[PDB]
């Protein structure tokens, strides 16, 4: 039981910064909210709900050696790095995240929930689902010896080529303890493959995946760069799109008609564009794709916001360094999105995307996830980089 | 050739207790029934047809170590326990049973039929059919090493994900010598999985299973806890439902329209509810499911009987201790079902569910399966716990 | 606590039948022995210690279909037969046995010790150790397809070809829970191989097996028909020889010098000799060997007894029908061995062979294993076929 | 490093299905039964980045096996392990409860003994003569 005394409170639902309030926390939930027991002196700060990042990869981080480490290291080696990744993410103000790829994240989520290590609340997708040769194919770029030794991937490994295989892949993700489903509708930038935006799913396969996920209470997030794959994913019935780099007017119209969410991930685009200029950082099959695709993300976000598409917060922090997720707010504001809208996209709209109703706002009965900063983020978005108070489930991790 | 002199005889077909009769048994069948050679003095007892339990698991029994014994013991070790299980079941008055899961039961049936060991007449299902990650998936809860060593289960192992796979699974059950088919339409309580009532079969897969079973002369029994899976199983065309914990008015209407049988298994619900309170008895992933689902079985049975659904006798004695199946009668009567109806549900309606016509009543030409108790079970249902005479196929096992 | 009143008591250690005595049993051991509480009336019987059979195969029985059942049945099917085998063996007066081959016997021993089924105390050897193509090779007679599918047997399967392999085979028998070691030094009669008496072990391999067994507290029993293999086994340091059909004067001299035990197993020889005359009972590769070797067992036993070799009791009841082990006494007496010596060879000398000191005689502090028969076995050996009292560990199984 | 069925055998207590699926352990898995296998086991420990060698000379308490103190190594196998470790700059520590296994480990040339529960006067004399360390 603790009472927090804030000088200003950000109303996520209304998008307005109110005056002094007092928040009483008991049993890990907000019990009372008074306008006007242990106590924490925050009267010179602005209190906001904890942020949610809807696209992270906590099991990895980009580096010059990332394309040769997979053949020499084991996942146990990556867990010890994920410890620090998760701690740095939590201490920056993000009390929950949506992990969208990797087999290390479910274990990290279990460890964090058991109290073994520090971190945010993790909604883990597990192994991503692709087609043969797709962006998430685990054996892209292997030589003949290794490929023959391991054999062709199947639904158990996340590679599907028919309706029944998609059904089995979703059921296998459920069997391994996932919270959400991720598919790669088109090609990617960082994969050891040739194409970057070609359609790699059919409409029927997407429909089968979505129906199976509906049976099991899951949501589906689709990775898409090109127009045709994005169109097929939208028609299939996915919940959100991740890298709509080549969104057109027709795609935006379909998104508005169907209510699909859009998660830009501007930070990853900027990072890959910057790293493409360095010689030898990327493999020769990856550099042209990164150079071409990383320079068309901010414009797409600005156009989508202007056209009325629903936008949510996500950074793809497995590409950039973990713990610097808060610069996506600055990028979004510089892209034309108002500061209040950008802050809402990470608190309440993020909770809508996740499908939960016990977080996202400072209201009675909700989880006590509260953060604070000295400045006013609405007046100046640059204040999001100085977070000095973090609370998650009623436990204070930073003061 | 023996003549039995009973003081009272229970007419299963009419549900009434008649007066003194004489039963003459020759060649293992009832030859004559006289109202008014070796002889057995039963003139101070009530003679009834042998009981049938439509849901047992003779190859296993619940215990505190049941979740770690599967990795250290072999089926040969379980057979030596099944010997005593079957003997105790037979001596309690149950001359036939329907085994609904486990690969040890066909062998026990063969041994009992050859006269090697004592037991009831067994209609064995063999391996139960599920989907990937389903309630009957044999590899739920295994770590990565064992899962990779054994590989993903297929139709040969009872795991199906399409119409053709369901066809092959039914044919493989036929190849291994089954008498009936069992599928798990929803999640369960005692499996090492997350869900307990979500739908795990599609209507088309159920239809394929039922059609294939029809080609081979089989009946299909469906395990179902949730509403949607139960609805899909009923629409597919199964013969009976096993744990309709969350039956609603629409489900009952469909059951009445289609003529589906309902087997409550109240004993297992009570047992799991009682054991959930003990700390450490169940794994942490099983305890909440048991606590939530075991407390809503008697009410469902009472509602189903009130609404006119057809009810048959079954206990799920693999959960509770074998040889105490007769307490299901007391539970049924305490649930509002009349004693005569409860006794009929185990003799004639059970024979209807099984699909046979040579047992279930004391009539000329039928199998000589006769039991007797000192009291009158109709007047007092508690008399079913004192069975002192058992005869099966004309052979006396208890006097 | 029970008191037994016998009219005559057989002193195993002295080999004499004494007069009336009273035996008091408490906690499963003999507490008092009085010459002159519950009570059992045995005053018209002769009480002897429970018998021990040093060569049985409780997991199998010879029959016309025994050479095609291994490809269609599973060990679980053989366990249900072993139940009756063990019960019949125990009820005939044999309270302990030494099982010398088969993987079903350790499980039967565990089940009997846990009280699940009735039977004698079992000292199980497990898988027998042989060389490639030897008498105990599990893949003798298989076609090319099956042989290629299963691969060549190694030390894990009981087939050894060097010193290190013998060491590993003994350690693997220890790992699987054995009580004694068995090796086949020569060829056999009932195996699907060509030879019947050729040497199949070298002296060094036998020495390695014996040394490894000594490290683990085991005894070694050797199957041997021919002279050279028997000589090699004796020189290696085994504890007993099983079928010394072709024993010579030099072999007997070595046996006397080293103190090796001899177990004739006359019953199996007579059985195979009788069955060889039936057409089609044995495969054509087995019939000549059986006909030639089964007719030279009684003479060998008589010669060995005349020459002063130490003789112990064993029948090989896996060949003959289980539960008729007591005819070996009649055969031994008809072979020239005195009745008292024959009875001693099954009570005290058998305990010496086993390596235990808590059984074999009716003495204070020993296990309460007592049997009784109406007649006097010393005066008439034919009285051993009428055993009406059996007690094991203080529990009465027959009265 | 252990022998078949030894205290450190990774497959002790498994049923037939799992044992058949994984197969019998060899030197790569740390189970040795001869001199050459011990050599290969030490080299495989070096290949996987070890700093010291551990062997189980006798049975243990917490393993899913029957015995607790019986000797599970021969003197020659211990000697081979120690020689191979000497070639690679390693030390050898021996787990031992019973007297005979402890004696064999000391004679083989190990550096320390871990659970000398049943140490006798002769074992202590050998330890003093050879300079072996004792870790209670
Ligand atoms: C293990 C982990 C999994 C993973 C997966 Cl499944 C997918 C991506 C991914 O699709 N990234 C984007 C990165 C990107 C590049 C440019 C513009 C926007 C985003 C891409 O390749 O198109 C991705 O970047 C990662 C990743 O960071 O590594
Ligand atoms: C080997 C054997 C096979 C087996 C199978 Cl296939 C299924 C069940 C089973 O579905 N039991 C029910 C037990 C139960 C629990 C609560 C209320 C009613 C019934 C369940 O888990 O929902 C089940 O209990 C068993 C069992 O007893 O072990
Ligand atoms: C499974 C079981 C194991 C077994 C083993 Cl390991 C060995 C024998 C065996 O060696 N029997 C003897 C039978 C025999 C035949 C003639 C004279 C004496 C004995 C033989 O074949 O020479 C043997 O008969 C048996 C047996 O009965 O089946
Ligand atoms: C994974 C890890 C490895 C391990 C190994 Cl390799 C060996 C032991 C071990 O030998 N422990 C001793 C524990 C013990 C017991 C009684 C007296 C002293 C010590 C034993 O079992 O005899 C041991 O305890 C452990 C252990 O703690 O688990
Ligand atoms: Zn992506
Ligand atoms: Zn991504
Ligand atoms: Zn069920
Ligand atoms: Zn069941
Ligand atoms: Zn033999
Ligand atoms: Zn034998
Ligand atoms: Zn240790």
Tokens 């949501």 belong to A219
What's the rounded Cα separation, in Å, for the pair A96 and A54? 9
Nearest Cα residue to D15 out of C176, C205, B144:
C176
Residue C3 Cα to chain centre, angstroms: 31
- At B106, list the tokens: 């066909």
Q: Is C37 exposed, middle or buried (0-12, 13-18, 19+ CB in 10 A)?
A: exposed
**Are C175 and D34 within 8 A, CB to CB?**
no
Query: Nearest chain B Cα to A178, which residue?
Result: B194
On chain C, the residues whose CB falls within 8 A of the CB of B80 are 79, 83, 107-108, 111, 116-117
Q: Supply the DSSP symbol for C43.
A: E
Question: Crossing angle, helix C105-113 and helix B75-91, to 10 degrees?
Answer: 50
Compute the residue count for chain C. Answer: 399
Q: How many CB atoms lie within 10 A of CB C155?
A: 23
Question: Ligand 1 mean position to A329 CA, how many Å?
Answer: 20
What's the rounded Cα separation, in Å, for the pair C263 and C224? 11
Do C15 and C44 contact (CB within 8 A), yes or no? Answer: no
| A122 strand-pairing partners | A97
What's the rounded Cα separation, in Å, for the pair B98 and A37? 63
| D94 strand-pairing partners | D55, D113
What's the rounded Cα separation, in Å, for the pair B228 and C158? 54
- At B144, list the tokens: 């990565």
At B392 the three-state DSSP class reads strand
Q: Which residues surround ligand 5, an ion (CB under 5 A)?
A: A 223, 242
At D27 the three-state DSSP class reads helix
Full DSSP string of B4-40: EEEEEEEETTTTEEE--EEEEEETTEEEEEEE--EEE
What's the rounded Cα separation, in Å, for the pair B241 and B258? 12
Nearest Cα residue to A184 out of A269, A246, A254, A241:
A241
Is the Cα torsion angle A336, A342, A348, A349 positive or negative in sign?
positive
- At A117, list the tokens: 């290590």
Q: Which residues of C72-82 are buried (b: 16+ CB within 10 A; e: fewer)?
A: eeebbbbbbbb
What's the rounded Cα separation, in Å, for the pair D105 and D71? 10
- At B381, list the tokens: 């249902």
Q: Which H or E element spans position C302?
A: helix C298-307
Q: How many CB atoms lie within 10 A of CB B8?
A: 21
What's the rounded Cα separation, in Å, for the pair A343 and A349? 9
Contacts of D23 (CB under 8 A, 6+ apart): none
Ligand 1 within 6 A of A223 CB?
A: yes
Q: Which H or E element spans position D112?
A: strand D112-113
Going by their DSSP bridges, the two strands B29-35 and B181-184 should be labelled as unpaired
Query: Nearest chain D Cα to C175, which residue?
Result: D5
Question: Crossing angle, helix A203-215 and helix A163-175, to 10 degrees?
Answer: 30
**Are B198 and A175 within 8 A, CB to CB?**
no
Nearest Cα residue to C175 out of C132, C212, C221:
C212
What's the rounded Cα separation, in Å, for the pair B234 and C79? 40
On chain B, the residues whose CB falls within 8 A of the CB of C104 are 76
At B344 the three-state DSSP class reads helix
What's the rounded Cα separation, in Å, for the pair B202 and B210? 13
**Are B80 and C108 within 8 A, CB to CB?**
yes
What's the rounded Cα separation, in Å, for the pair C30 and C21? 13
Q: For residue A35, what are the CA distances in angstroms to A19, A30, A38, A278, B248? A: 8, 14, 18, 54, 47
Contacts of B151 (CB under 8 A, 6+ apart): none
- At D62, list the tokens: 């917490």
Q: How many CB atoms lie within 10 A of CB B236?
A: 22
Q: Where are the beta strands (DSSP E) in C185-323?
A: 220-223, 240-241, 261-262, 310-311
- What number does the ligand 3 atom closest to the CA of C100 have? 6
Q: For residue C399, what are the CA distances in angstroms to A62, C84, C396? A: 82, 19, 7
For chain D, state the CA radius of gyration: 15
Q: Supply the DSSP symbol for C244.
A: -
Tokens 């499908």 belong to A355
What's the rounded Cα separation, in Å, for the pair D25 and D29? 6
Q: Which of D15, D16, D21 sits opposite B150 (nearest CB)?
A: D21
Q: Which H or E element spans position B124?
A: strand B121-124
Nearest Cα residue to A130 out of A155, A100, A167:
A155
Q: How many CB atoms lie within 10 A of CB A210?
A: 23
On chain B, the residues whose CB falls within 8 A of the CB of C74 are 107
Q: What is the least distance, in Å, from the CA of B149 to any CA of chain D?
A: 6
What's the rounded Cα separation, in Å, for the pair C203 and C207? 6
At B267 the three-state DSSP class reads helix
On chain C, the residues whose CB falls within 8 A of the CB of D9 are 175
| A33 strand-pairing partners | A23
Nearest Cα residue to C314 out of C332, C299, C296:
C332
- What number does the ligand 1 atom closest to the CA of A128 have? 6
On chain C, the residues whose CB falls within 8 A of the CB of D12 are 175
Is the Cα torsion angle C127, C133, C134, C135 positive or negative in sign?
positive
Contacts of C61 (CB under 8 A, 6+ apart): C81, C85, C318, C321, C322
What's the rounded Cα separation, in Å, for the pair B101 and C128? 35
Rounded to the nearest 10°, the torsion over CA B169, B172, B176, B177 is: 80
Question: Crossing angle, helix B266-276 and helix B298-307, to 10 degrees?
Answer: 160
Ligand 3 within 6 A of C269 CB?
A: yes
What's the rounded Cα separation, in Å, for the pair B370 and B42? 12
Question: Ligand 10 mean position to C318 CA, how many Å?
Answer: 7
For chain B, state the CA radius of gyration: 21
| A398 strand-pairing partners | A390
Going by their DSSP bridges, the two strands C94-99 and C51-56 should be labelled as parallel
Resolution in angstrom units:
2.4
What's the rounded Cα separation, in Å, for the pair C158 and C126? 10
First vs last C-alpha separation in chain B: 16
Query: Nearest chain C Cα to D34, which residue?
Result: C164
- At C136, list the tokens: 């105990």
Q: What kind of experiment solved this structure?
A: cryo-EM
Q: How many CB atoms lie within 10 A of CB D11?
A: 17
What's the rounded Cα separation, in Å, for the pair C108 and C57? 11
Is the Cα torsion angle B331, B337, B340, B345 positive or negative in sign?
negative
Q: What are phi and psi of A143, to 5 degrees?
A: -80, 180
Q: How many CB atoms lie within 10 A of CB A250?
A: 10
**Are D13 and B72 within 8 A, CB to CB?**
yes
Q: Supply the DSSP symbol for B101.
A: S
- What number does the ligand 1 atom closest to the CA of A191 have? 21
**Interface residues of chain B, partner chain A, Cβ below 8 Å:** 131-134, 137, 140, 152, 161-162, 165, 193-195, 198-200
Going by their DSSP bridges, the two strands A121-124 and A94-99 should be labelled as parallel
Tokens 């065309």 belong to B237
- At C104, list the tokens: 């079903």
At D127 the three-state DSSP class reads helix
At C24 the three-state DSSP class reads strand
- What number does the ligand 4 atom closest to the CA of D61 have? 21
What's the rounded Cα separation, in Å, for the pair B141 and C331? 58
At C290 the three-state DSSP class reads helix
Show the 3-state SS of chain A.
Answer: CEEEEEEEEEECCCCEEECCEEEEEECCEEEEEEECCEEEEEEEEEEEECEEEEEECCCCCCCCCCCCHHHCCCHHHHHHHHHHHHHHHHHCCEEEEEECCCCCHHHHHHHHHCCCCCCCEEEECCCCEECCCCCCCCCCCCCHHHHHHHCCCCHHHCECCCHHHHHHHHHHHHHCCCCCEEEECECCCCCCCCCCCCECCCHHHHHHHHHHHHHCCCCEEEECCCHHHHHHHHHHCCCEECCCCCCCHHHHHHHHHHCCEECCCHHHHHHHHHHHCCCCCCCCCCHHHHHHHCCCCHHHHHHHHHHCCEECCCCCCCCCCCCCCCHHHHHHHHCCCCHHHHHHCCCHHHHHHHCCCCCCCCCCCCECCEEEECCCCCCCHHHHHCCCEEEECCEEEEC
Q: What is the least distance, in Å, from the CA of D50 to any CA of chain C?
A: 26
Going by their DSSP bridges, the two strands C21-26 and C2-11 should be labelled as antiparallel
**Are B73 and D15 within 8 A, CB to CB?**
yes
- At D17, list the tokens: 């299905």
Ligand 3 within 6 A of C153 CB?
A: no
Start-end of H helices in chain B: 75-91, 105-113, 144-150, 163-175, 203-215, 227-236, 249-258, 266-276, 287-293, 298-307, 327-334, 339-344, 348-354
- At A37, list the tokens: 């027991």
First vs last C-alpha separation in chain A: 16
- At A241, list the tokens: 């799109």
Q: Which H or E element spans position C231?
A: helix C227-236
Strands laid side by side in the B51-56 sheet: B51-56, B94-99, B121-124
Do C121 and C392 contact (CB within 8 A), yes or no? Answer: yes
Q: What are phi and psi of C114, to 5 degrees?
A: -80, -5
- At D41, list the tokens: 């086991």
For chain C, state the CA radius of gyration: 21
Q: For residue B242, what are the CA distances in angstroms to A243, B102, B185? A: 47, 16, 10
Contacts of B3 (CB under 8 A, 6+ apart): B22, B23, B24, B25, B37, B38, B39, B40
């Amino acid at each position: 039981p603790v009472a927090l005394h804030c000088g200003k409170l950000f109303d996520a639902r209304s998008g307005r910064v109110l005056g002094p309030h007092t928040v009483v926390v008991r049993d890990g939930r907000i019990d009372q909210l008074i306008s006007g027991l242990a106590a924490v002196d925050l009267r010179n700060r602005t209190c906001l709900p904890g942020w949610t990042d809807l696209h992270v990869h906590l099991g990895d981080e980009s580096s010059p050696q990332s394309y040769s480490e997979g053949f020499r290291l084991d996942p146990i080696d990556f867990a010890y790095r994920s410890v620090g990744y998760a701690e740095r993410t939590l201490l920056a103000g993000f009390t929950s995240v949506r992990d969208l790829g990797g087999e290390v994240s479910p274990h990290l989520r279990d460890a964090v929930n058991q109290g073994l290590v520090k971190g945010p609340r993790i909604f883990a997708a597990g192994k991503s689902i692709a087609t043969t040769g797709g962006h998430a194919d685990p054996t892209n770029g292997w030589n003949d010896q290794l490929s023959h030794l391991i054999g062709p991937p199947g639904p158990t490994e996340g590679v599907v080529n028919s309706v029944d295989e998609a059904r089995q892949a979703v059921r296998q993700r459920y069997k391994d303890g996932s919270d959400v489903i991720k598919i790669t509708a088109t090609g990617g930038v960082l994969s050891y493959a040739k194409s970057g935006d070609a359609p790699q799913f059919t409409v029927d396969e997407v429909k089968a995946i979505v129906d199976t996920a509906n049976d099991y209470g899951y949501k589906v997030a689709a990775h898409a760069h090109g127009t045709e794959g994005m169109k097929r994913a939208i028609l299939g019935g996915v919940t959100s799109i991740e890298h709509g780099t080549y969104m057109t007017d027709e795609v935006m119209r379909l998104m508005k008609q169907h209510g699909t969410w859009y998660v830009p991930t501007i930070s990853a685009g900027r990072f890959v564009a910057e790293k493409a200029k360095i010689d030898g950082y990327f493999p020769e099959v990856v550099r042209p794709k990164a150079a071409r695709i990383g320079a068309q993300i901010q414009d797409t976000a600005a156009k989508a916001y202007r056209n009325g598409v629903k936008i949510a917060f996500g950074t793809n922090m497995g590409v950039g360094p973990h713990g610097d997720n808060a610069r996506e707010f600055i990028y979004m504001v510089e892209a034309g999105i108002p500061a209040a809208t950008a802050l809402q996209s990470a608190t309440v709209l993020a909770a809508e995307v996740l499908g939960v109703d016990d977080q996202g706002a400072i209201e009675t009965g909700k989880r006590a996830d509260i953060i604070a900063m000295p400045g006013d983020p609405v007046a100046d978005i640059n204040a999001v980089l100085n977070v000095d108070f973090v609370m998650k489930d009623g436990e204070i991790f930073r003061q």
